[PDB]
Design a protein around this ligand. Sequence first.
Ligand SMILES: Nc1ncnc2c1ncn2[C@@H]1O[C@H](COP(=O)(O)OP(=O)(O)O)[C@@H](O)[C@H]1O
Ligand SMILES: Nc1ncnc2c1ncn2[C@@H]1O[C@H](COP(=O)(O)OP(=O)(O)O)[C@@H](O)[C@H]1O
Lengths: 76, 76, 828, 819
Amino acid sequence: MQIFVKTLTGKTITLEVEPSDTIENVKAKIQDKEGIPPDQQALIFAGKQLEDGRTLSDYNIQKESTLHLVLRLRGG
Amino acid sequence: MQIFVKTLTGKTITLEVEPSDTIENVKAKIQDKEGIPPDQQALIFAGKQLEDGRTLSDYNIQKESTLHLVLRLRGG
Amino acid sequence: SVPTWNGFSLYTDETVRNAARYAYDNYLGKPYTGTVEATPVNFGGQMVYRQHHGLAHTLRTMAYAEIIVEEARKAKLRGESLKTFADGRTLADVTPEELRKIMIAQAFFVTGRDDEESSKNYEKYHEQSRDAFLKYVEENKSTLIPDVFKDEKDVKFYADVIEDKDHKWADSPAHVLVNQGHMVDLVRVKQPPESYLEYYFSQLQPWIGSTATEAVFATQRQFFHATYEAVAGFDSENKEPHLVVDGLGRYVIGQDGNPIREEGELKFFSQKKKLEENQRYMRVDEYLKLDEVQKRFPGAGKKLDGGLPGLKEYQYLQRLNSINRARCENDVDFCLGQLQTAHHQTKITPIKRAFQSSSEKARRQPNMDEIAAARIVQQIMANPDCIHDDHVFLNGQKLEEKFFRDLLAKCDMAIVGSLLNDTDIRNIDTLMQHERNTEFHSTDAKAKPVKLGETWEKTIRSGGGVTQIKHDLIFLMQNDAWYHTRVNAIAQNRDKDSTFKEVLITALMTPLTNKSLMDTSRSPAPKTLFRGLDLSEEFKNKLINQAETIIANTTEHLFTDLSTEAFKQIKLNDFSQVSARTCASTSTNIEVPRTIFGSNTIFEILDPDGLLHPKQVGTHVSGSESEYSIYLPEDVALVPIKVSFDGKTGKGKDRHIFTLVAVKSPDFTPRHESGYAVGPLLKMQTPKLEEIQRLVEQAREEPDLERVFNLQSRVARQAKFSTESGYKTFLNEKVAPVLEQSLNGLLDNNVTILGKVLSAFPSDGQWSAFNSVEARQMKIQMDAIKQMVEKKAVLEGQILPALAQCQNALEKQNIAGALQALRNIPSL
Amino acid sequence: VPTWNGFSLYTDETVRNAARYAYDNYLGKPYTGTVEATPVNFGGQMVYRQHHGLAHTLRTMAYAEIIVEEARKAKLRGESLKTFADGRTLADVTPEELRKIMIAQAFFVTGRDDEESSKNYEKYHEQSRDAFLKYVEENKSTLIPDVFKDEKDVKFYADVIEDKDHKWADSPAHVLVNQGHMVDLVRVKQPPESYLEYYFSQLQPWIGSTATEAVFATQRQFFHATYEAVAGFDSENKEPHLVVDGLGRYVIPIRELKFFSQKKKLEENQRYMRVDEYLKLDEVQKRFPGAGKKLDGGLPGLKEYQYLQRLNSINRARCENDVDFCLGQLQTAHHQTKITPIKRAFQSSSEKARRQPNMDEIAAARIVQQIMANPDCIHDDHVFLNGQKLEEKFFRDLLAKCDMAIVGSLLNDTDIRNIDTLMQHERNTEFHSTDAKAKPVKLGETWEKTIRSGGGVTQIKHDLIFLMQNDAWYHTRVNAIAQNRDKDSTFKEVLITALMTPLTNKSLMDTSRSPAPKTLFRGLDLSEEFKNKLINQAETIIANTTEHLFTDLSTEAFKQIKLNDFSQVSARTCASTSTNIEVPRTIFGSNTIFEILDPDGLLHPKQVGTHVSGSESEYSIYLPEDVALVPIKVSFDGKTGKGKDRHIFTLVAVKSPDFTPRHESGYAVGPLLKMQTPKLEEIQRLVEQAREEPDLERVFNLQSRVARQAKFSTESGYKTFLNEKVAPVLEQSLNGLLDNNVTILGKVLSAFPSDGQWSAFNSVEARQMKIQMDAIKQMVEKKAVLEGQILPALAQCQNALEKQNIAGALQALRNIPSL
Ligand SMILES: Nc1ncnc2c1ncn2[C@@H]1O[C@H](COP(=O)(O)OP(=O)(O)O)[C@@H](O)[C@H]1O
Ligand SMILES: Nc1ncnc2c1ncn2[C@@H]1O[C@H](COP(=O)(O)OP(=O)(O)O)[C@@H](O)[C@H]1O
């Protein structure tokens, strides 16, 4: 199974993973393929934020679903 | 019917009376015979004081019964 | 198994006195027609012809016989086995009639003496005495017989006792009493004292017992004192040679330390028998230490003071030569009065000897609980509205029935009365109005209820001032049995089915009646009162047993002090509470309890030490009840000394007279727990501190900050437009800062900012620079804010801290610092 | 009335391309004819055709745009508009149809070879039509398959352009093209009043009078936007009125109104009708609101020399020569005509910043600081502060009645520091997302272990902001409670919201340095029912928001805006926004987007987090109480990922005292006042101590000791001393304590023996008793001082206080009489 996480810059990252993968692991893959640390990673699907520790199967994220990644940092 | 009222001085007064005579009336008779005002008269019979308004027959005082007279006054 | 006495006394019986008058007027008072010591003697100017064997001696022998029979009766009651005569009778079995005959004989026992002469002439002297007796009986045959003597066989019996033909001094009670009564008078003239005392003691002791015999000889010394006869001492270590009285001989101690005894048994020796070298008479102390003597004579080791206590030999001697010796030897009624007073005193001294002594005769001072009780009474009386059918409600405290009964039982309500005043007596009328319709129930369950306050208003109360109220209250106590039966029963805690208001009225009227009596009685305190009671046969018989036990265990002594047992029996059998706790009615005329009321029980209450403090009740005209009221003090006991059968009442029940002596002692004080009255009084006085409550409620008021902030808005729009010279600049520069400061100060709660912003408010003169309308309203609002800040800066900054300092300075007991806290307040 | 799709003359590419083509091929080329073929020069740049060139054409297009707009509004206001033969009104123009109309309008004048009026009209329109068809053919590929359905359509619009039979009212195309051209004539007339009345009379039936005022007002603003001269308007002008139909005159008034040609010279004492006389006629006033009114020429704030120096600026030639520039000018003017009526309908405000704090906000701030300072006041059911219980309703009242941003301005950095301790107190407090499927999260533990990052107060502020921004289990509940739209919230959730909203506002305010943006985008996922409500409200407001010339409809705009305001949807919480519409549209798939325009800086947005590439570019708005988000446009923007319809509401922030809400003071000041109420424990202990019962038991014990010693004693002066100096003071003291009489108590103190009178005797019991006599002396001295000195002075103080005599109240405590 492969999914596509699009970002605000327009880049579309593709990650082929299995539903047992956790979003923490998805954040790790997004790091390896692009270099974006998971502490800057905000993952959205169908207007719902994904919380770390739960897996894709908990969020009904399925075949070729597209999640969205935005960088979310503290100020200063 | 005649009764005897004995006093502390030793005198024995004899009174002709009826069993219906009230204690007020007996005191009046002792007054007439001796000059003792009834407000100073305390009449005892069988160790019991006689109440004004009650009668001789009420107190079982019968023929030749003996009552006792003591002077009882307030102080001053 | 011992019969009750009937009150026969040597000192009240007329017949015996007449016999003594006859003996004196006929023989005693006449001079000795003989030789030996016939020379008369003079005492304080009066002649006494017979001095050793005259009137006083005879009367003393009669007194001896009386107390010997008495002590025999007591000893038998204590369970002692007494020596019996041939008919099985002991001296205890002597009837009063028999004692009268014996005493009449005793009167003539010495009349036949022509001089003092002794052993020679003894028959004659008794023969003539016998004749003197017989003559008397014959001259008074009309009266003596049979009323006294029954038959001429009896008269010859007692005459035969007087004659003493065959020295059978123990044939009958009459023989023992006449002969031993005569012997009991010989102690005084008979040195050495110890040998004689032991002898006579040994002669009496078998008949009545050792305890009884000690009582006899002690009472005898008191009779000697009463009749101005010398009283010797007694030294168990006397070295003078012992005298063997039976035969006026001696016992001897030989070359060794041994008393010469027989085959043991002490060898008799004549006095004139001169015997061996280094052989010596046995001394008095050696005799008194012999085992055989100690087993029968308690005088071993003991010493007795001669003469009178409190007098030295010149005073004692000048007393023995007083003229009253001649009145005792010449005046039958006088010598009998002396002996009567001595005999009576020997009935009190043992009682007072068994308990702690008391010096003070007056009721004690009030205690905590009595003072509190008095206050509570005064307040109930001042405000009768506090009286509810179930309780009294005073100053937030609920007083139930048990409280007032505890008042009745634990307080000396006479003392409480002493703590009351005439305004409470005056308030009785108001109380009675409040209790106009309170039914009062006599203890006679047949008699009807009586309305208390109505009967008071309409029949008892007679107008006038406080004294008349007191006499009215006393008259209620004296006249109305529906009142005093219930009241007395409640005070003595023997009431059945009493209402609360009856208990309360009892609790209020007992001290009020005591104050009434105390204030209105001027009579001298009598020393003999009579109280009448109509008791059940069962309860009276219980009182008879208690009393006779007490009497039997109250004895005089010489050597053996049985006080502890008197204590035990008096404390077991005391019935003083029968006359305690209430205003007990008494009279000086025994015919009021005996004849008027037909009481079966009479308490002859003797107060020789003035301990009862009785008060006069009502009038004392002839024919009155002669009534006095006693409220028994807590430490005074009515100890019985005599119980007499006095005959039958009108209803044919038996009547007894208990003679009671008031005795005061801390041993009779009761143990009560303090606080029964003080507690409720202190709670009644716990302060309502409403002023401090309103002070704290005032320190809890919230400031109106909304008014201050809105006021800043007002000053702003006020200042937006400037209309007057120096109004708006001033507003901006002098007002708005104080409003910001105040709002903040208030807002913050700081009191320093508030204290100095108080200094920041403008003067009235700086405002008077502006006379605009909104300027005036502004100054009124600024005055309101200054008040709002002044309240906080003064309370929180000055007052409340000064009270904290005061309180802390009080919990440390530094009162000077506490008043410093309020006085030394720094300004702002 | 259908919802628009956001089709604008100023954004649609096709229309701009057609205008480029027209300029490029015709309008920018010189006149091959005679009349006014002579070019004109503006600031160095040449305009070849100035009266009938590019700027004129673009203005005709803009006219058709606002004519359709105002017609739509008038239909929405319920106005009856003139129908075409098929029953359709001008409101019924679709965006596709309008695009076709405007595209045609581009070429309506291309076929002009000069300025000649009357002769050679037909030829110039023939040439215009040919030019149009040429354009269509050249790009036929692009648009016939798109914009025109077929060649019949193209022949339709070409037939409108040609104008063969002067059928100027057959269709929307004819009215819009011809009347749009007619409107642009309001520039060179003599005199303006007669012509303006005429054109007004021409347009009014189709769209209505209100709409027509809007059109010509907006037209003057387009003139200013395109550097064309703007005439005045005097209803009291004395110049003779000219009848526009036929360039004639009326004379006085002679009716059959009798037409007159100009050249018909007529009678003595007979004169042409004046323009003001024309405007005062009943029939004219019934249809033209210009009666009595005057309009100033030129620009307000410019005198004729500055205005004139503007008309010759180069921007006139940029407008006549630069399609993108003239379209930008018209776009900015068109946008401004949507705002000016709104600010015109409400009271103006001079200050742009939040008001100063009011009493309840100040008190609220204090209560927040005290709660933060002592979290122990926090129980699961309530807050218990200084003997006062604040329940859920209190904190909801704070959230609803207080401007929590102002409250935050009243907090300090110590409260920020106390955030950490508060989170420690709530280490294990469950927080529930509005997503009931998501798990509960431990508040303080998540704070300590994942949010908080050490550092100083500023870093705590950025941590809190990061919390609000990142953790939906927090900000969903928090936002929902602040807007009073929460369901099944715990009290600690309401409390945490109530404390965290002002603290977050302080965090943002203190930490935000960016210059405030003027266009923010907010995403909402609303129900179809609620969104439709918002659509109706907005479209109502827009329909009653119009420009004017003579008739000021501000009152109705006011009325409808206050009836249909939905500013509260963005109020009461720290609402999240972004500068990138793709954050709410693309990332979160919201079906509702607020294009919030703050051209006057009234929203005070604060920056949230970082704005790196790929960030949410988030700013946070806490709506001020007197700012309204007034809709000016509602656009359908397509469908979301879930296939729901997405709309964009464009909202303009307007600040006015009219939008201020009426609240009742005291909701917060009260509890704060209760908190300053003292307990006065020391005074409670003073009265409890003044209620102590005296220890008479000790007095009796001492009386017993004195009794048993004075009854038995061989000493003479110790027995006389005891029975005469000691026992009386004990009896009197016992009585004074039993009766509480302060007079006896005050003087028995002098009766106690001295330590020297006791010291004369060195017995053991003498000392043992002297200790007790001193203890009782302390007892009665203590009692006689309270009742005799203190309590009466406290009564005097209190009485002097309820009387407002403060100086005498302090006298009561200072002036204590001795005994
Ligand atoms: N042991 C005794 N028992 C009874 N009576 C006695 C006893 N001894 C003496 N008496 C009485 O004392 C009387 C003698 O008294 P009196 O002649 O005056 O004294 P004395 O014995 O010294 O000569 C006798 O008649 C006798 O009654
Ligand atoms: N009542 C009207 N309705 C529609 N369009 C009109 C009306 N009156 C004038 N027009 C428009 O005005 C245009 C005339 O403009 P033009 O020839 O440039 O100026 P002039 O009118 O000075 O000759 C016509 O093409 C016509 O479409």
